[PDB]
Symmetry: D2
Subunit: 294 residues, 4 copies
């Protein structure tokens, strides 16, 4: 479970000017994560523009990430969908594929009941052998998967973790009370992730890790070892990035930041995501200098 | 004249058999029901039609099925919402020269674009079709709130003609009206506040309740357009338990059960992740139907 | 009931540099409201710094307002308290006093139940002959008096009106359905007040009326006569004031605006209220020019 | 040393007879209970003590009664909150040279001052006393949220020593700690999250639950201060139904009933606008007391 703990990068999907996926930028990013202690890469999640990649593109990008990784770092596939049949289909695409697990978000827009969530994730789980990381982010989905529901789903053998993005830190022990000792809790909120780990969480699926991979890996290791004062000093250096990478909707700011650091050639996104505004750019650039990255 | 875009427009359920396959015989009944009862237009494969769980192709086939069954007797508006601009375009192109009268297109959900992103999204969609576009704002589902200033910018585009405003924030009526021409159409997307929305100057409602109270909703809208607000309020009071309790569980779980209870559809089957109505919800909806004098 | 409908001013309590109440400024304000068609004056409400006037000062300021009014305009006393015994006592202070009615807010800070609200307002009502205007403003009090509770209280003979400050316009017909035809609904939210009246409300207890009394009186009359297009043209001229009088906490901006228009000598407030900041001042000044008042 | 300002501090009820008069015999029992069971300090005439419905003079008399009954056996902290700065000063001056160890002072409620207003409010209060001041942030009651930056500014004043942070927003712990010296004290004002708050670096809790579980709360706080978080969590799990259900109706309605049920007070009478616990609430609190093994 080393691959499901610590600093896991919510990896950008780098694009050329046309919005086509850039293989050479992907190679650079993956090499960067291997070199700097990132525990694993989430491919085609939220920060990877899952929304504007086709069902097919999803597949290709994950397989490209897998190929470039070449066994040097674990890859987790983003496989969320708001229709259970589509989530199953996305999941089946990666059976026997070399990915180590899947990251699967609560259905968005249609606002299912907690029983609908249970049935959704149960069906997905039953259609694969792969480890499943649940993902709760009500600010994007309009659905809040409550702890009791997480508890029910944790009983399923291949439902192994949750990415809890609410920033509501009381959830850590609410979930822990209901699940086995080996169930994995991951922060989905960079600004509160160190707090989350100090309370008993096991890592973070991180946007900040895109541009501060070594610092994020170090902070998570320090936190795992109970060296909270030391972890906090790193967290303070990164706090402006934890906040300002969301000055405009993720991943607009983090793609610009990758560009500014030389990690990707362009910060192009696909509509409806837009290029960072001047005002946002100046703010991110300042945060990057506060962190000593630029 | 703009009548196909005003009054009571039904957010039509997509009826299914027990395997979750679309039921053509049920859709025939529903459409005949709306023809017979004063419904202005049918939204096909919108939110209440389980757009989320119909494939790209099914979006197409179910809208065409509905048009074929309407047989020119009632206008049909296609739900063409997507959170990727390229997908919204593709969905919209499917209906160019189809007989549908317009498209209902929701703000991108989940990815939370900026207002400029919204502007560019809807501008691109509008530029790839001749069909009239009805914008749709529902932040409680999308995580994105399209502000009145942004609606104003979009309303300058020739084929962006209307907004389905679902927030239930009634201040939006005149905030939008202040920014748009007098022919731009405002539609409620919140049944419980829709009469209020019309009394303030709105032009109609894209309605869930209208699935099971089509004549009543059509009458209420006509009265409100005529300034007959006391008469309209009497209908609204009769319907208010439905306006609320059709959301006791996530739409369209309650309204599909209610269609079944009234004999409009054969089954109330939904596709996962939507679930059959609970006993608790069912008893509540049944009571609201009886309050409305429909059961 | 003319005195409980139309444009009712939430009157500032003007002060000197020391925070003492300025009689001469009060005279000027009251003369202004007589001359410009204001239906009534609320004395020592929220905009009048009820919070930082003593139980005694409350009394004096209301009696001074009454004396300066000299029968030319009705005066309504702010008599809200979060303890029922204190609300009773404040109310009894004005029995046989010449005030036409009282404005009484839901208890703040202690967050009573709806039954606690019912009992609070019932006791107050039973201890006076004066008309009672309920006041709901959950953003300040932490208590939301729901329509059903308003309905129950409207059955009491001297509970005659509600100042509904939520800006939630669905409340108009929710309340109307539950009360007699003669119960009075007043907006407590200037930005939405014209909407509120268009839906069937009878007036507004207004901050904007402090600096645009004639315009507010006209808009309310137009609205009462069903001349909504004409009312709307006035509302558009005033909208920047409806919003920017709250650029900093009311009544910081409106007191500066009274000062800028020559209605009061100083814009001094009592702590914890603070002088308007430069940034707020510029914004209010601009709103006043948009309205053609400055 | 700072011990009177850390650990389990009780937000003590003000016990009343059936006419709503303060009951001295009941307060004696409560205070003896807290002496006997490890409570660090007593907050007298705070939020749970019905500060809102005690007069200015009663604020004074009840705090002095409590000090007299404590008889130097447990420290007493006076609630001195007011939404007018001049009133907070007057309330605070009442205790200069009284034997109380400090004051608990809430952000002004209802009038919604700016952060600078908060700064000036608390600065003026602090300048008119030698007593240590514990700031109190509870936006759900006040309509005002004192931000961490403002707490940092105030913490520079010599006799502003602590904050009771009631938001349950656990990110505030290190946001405040980053801005204040290492001797500034952070106390939870949210029983349900208080252990989490302490695990993150908080120093204690001003607690409602401690009214009916004083020994348990004292033990949990001691364990958390010692880093014994698993042992502390076991107590927290036992108490969590109380931490929640003591707010099933507005505090202090439930906790006064619970004191009565446990024989700590003679009556659970409150002053209007607070009301006797409903049957529904009573059954819920009784069940939580039984879950905690206190009844
Ligand atoms: Cl992700
Ligand atoms: Cl979230
Ligand atoms: Cl729809
Ligand atoms: Cl919404
Ligand atoms: Cl007022
Ligand atoms: Cl409010
Ligand atoms: Cl307290
Ligand atoms: Cl709070
Ligand atoms: Mg730009
Ligand atoms: Mg069932
Ligand atoms: Mg200043
Ligand atoms: Mg009772």
């Amino acid at each position: 479970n080393a691959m499901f703990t610590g600093s896991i990068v919510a990896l950008v999907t780098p694009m050329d000017e046309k919005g086509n996926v850039s293989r050479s930028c992907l190679k650079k990013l993956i090499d960067y994560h291997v070199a700097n202690g990132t525990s694993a890469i989430v491919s085609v999640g939220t920060t990877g523009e899952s929304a504007t990649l086709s069902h097919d593109e999803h597949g290709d990008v994950v397989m490209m990430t897998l190929e470039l990784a070449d066994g040097r770092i674990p890859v987790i596939a983003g496989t969320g969908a708001n229709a259970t049949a589509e989530a199953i289909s996305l999941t089946q695409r990666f059976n026997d594929s070399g990915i180590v697990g899947c990251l699967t978000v609560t259905p968005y827009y249609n606002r299912p009941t907690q029983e609908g969530l249970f049935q959704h994730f149960k069906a997905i789980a039953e259609h694969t052998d792969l480890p499943q990381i649940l993902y709760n982010v009500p600010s994007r989905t309009g659905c809040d998967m409550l702890p009791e529901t997480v508890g029910r789903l944790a009983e399923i053998k291949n439902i192994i973790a949750i990415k809890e993005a609410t920033g509501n830190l009381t959830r850590v022990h609410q979930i822990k009370e209901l699940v086995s000792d080996d169930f994995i809790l991951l922060s989905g909120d960079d600004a509160s992730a160190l707090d989350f780990m100090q309370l008993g969480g096991h890592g973070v699926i991180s946007v900040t890790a895109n541009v501060a991979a070594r610092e994020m890996a170090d902070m998570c290791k320090l936190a795992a070892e109970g060296q909270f004062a030391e972890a906090r000093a790193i967290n303070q250096r990164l706090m402006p990035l934890h906040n300002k990478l969301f000055v405009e909707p993720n991943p607009i700011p983090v793609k610009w930041a990758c560009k500014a650091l030389g990690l990707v050639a362009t910060d192009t996104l696909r509509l409806p995501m837009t290029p960072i505004t001047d005002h946002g750019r100046d703010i991110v650039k300042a945060a990057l200098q506060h962190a000593g990255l630029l």
